[model samples]
Target: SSLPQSFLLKSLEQVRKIQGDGAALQEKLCATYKLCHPEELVLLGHSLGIPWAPLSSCPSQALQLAGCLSQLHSGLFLYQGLLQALEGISPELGPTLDTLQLDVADFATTIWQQMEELGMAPALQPTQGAMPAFASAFQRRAGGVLVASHLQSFLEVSYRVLRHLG
Candidate 1:
């Protein structure tokens, strides 16, 4: 259960408490969509080809809107998977990772539900990509850092889109 603590000393500390409004997505997802855990998503995630970080969409000046929303939802969904995978990281980040996933879920629902409201939602819902199994605590925590770092950047980009939407 124990491994090198080197990753702990890195950006792990910076990975928690990400900015962005919690979409309260878990409550909705668990009831309707059946995404009870990250494990449930693994099979389909692999089936889906394990998406790349997400193709860059969302033009700033022209503001196409469709691609922007698609990218925004995907970005939030990616963080949820990362946060969910890191659920068992270190005690320091343990409880916190769960929180991150919830916030991200809520964020995604905001766009998804709103898009649905306007009938502009995509035909199919996007699923999380296959998550990697960590061999050691080092890799887990290291992944923790990357997940958090990715969350922060995604958070910023999401804010940008939110600005356009609002």
Candidate 2:
């Protein structure tokens, strides 16, 4: 057997480790602050001026598999970048932030592989550049939450779309 299989096995631990972190953080966010739903948090999102990444390529009217697939992986990649921006939101938020960030990058890769094998993948990858500059910790936290919500909502659409094919 080639080293790739063993290498693949090693990688799952990292994915699994961060996935646990991601779920824990999501549960805690809801249980602790009651800030569960993204739409419900829209008011705070607006006040915080949090930006939402548009899955412009995704829609029921004219769903282009390649176009939308790229966007899901694209948006996923972008969210991880935002997580990096939220690095120092607070000491209390330290582990949660770091762990969630890693998990997101991991999931981004999962979808990315799907795109790659499907031959719809872009030749290059998503670029990380300047982001919204929030003035305070509260704003940063709000931005963080909104980005996470975007991830959840964005994936929800993809989930439904994939189901339609089956």
Candidate 3:
């Protein structure tokens, strides 16, 4: 339980590096995909009766601001921060962190067990089971530059921030 101070510092540095690298990657993605402004989304929100202020008008700076803000929403850095914070509580709480690890492991194990029991092979089916038909349909092609995958990654990051309840 007693880790060397140097080790703890190194651990924190490593986490910081992960955070930094993640942010850099996000910037690259946003620049590449043009997900810099929230104007279009805000406009759509207005159509839905949820008005919100548009972002800064300057393209480059606005994009930079939006990208950084949105990238924090990404799960990797945000959730990792939460996890680290949780781990920083009383040393008596170490077991809870360990339990979180075990829970993730068990979840994976249970899914694998279910697959084995069902004799099901890995598959990707287009069955729209619970997803509404419109969910898969695009209302309009994105006029701006954000690529689907880039947006997906941004959404993923954002999702983590909102969902990291603990």
Whole-model lDDT, model 3? 0.33
Q: Write the per-residue lDDT of candidate 3 for residues 1-166, one digit (tens) a residue.
A: 1223443344334334444443443344346444444444554333433111122221223223334222332323323333343331234334443443343233334323433433444445745322101111121112111222233343344333223210
Top model by lDDT, which number? 2
lDDT on C-alpha atoms for all candidate structures: 0.50, 0.60, 0.33
Clashing residue pairs in all predictions, respectively, total 3, 0, 5
After superposition, candidate 3 runs with Cα above 4 Å error: 1-3, 37-166
Model 2 gets an lDDT of 0.60
Residue-level lDDT of model 1, residues 1-166, one tens digit each, is 0112332222122223346222232333344334445444444445434343553644443235545666666666666776676565766545555666665565566566655543464567855458766656655555554444445566665554455444
How high is the lDDT of residue 162 in model 3?
A: 23
TM-score versus the correct structure, for each prediction:
0.60, 0.64, 0.25
Ranking by TM-score: 2, 1, 3
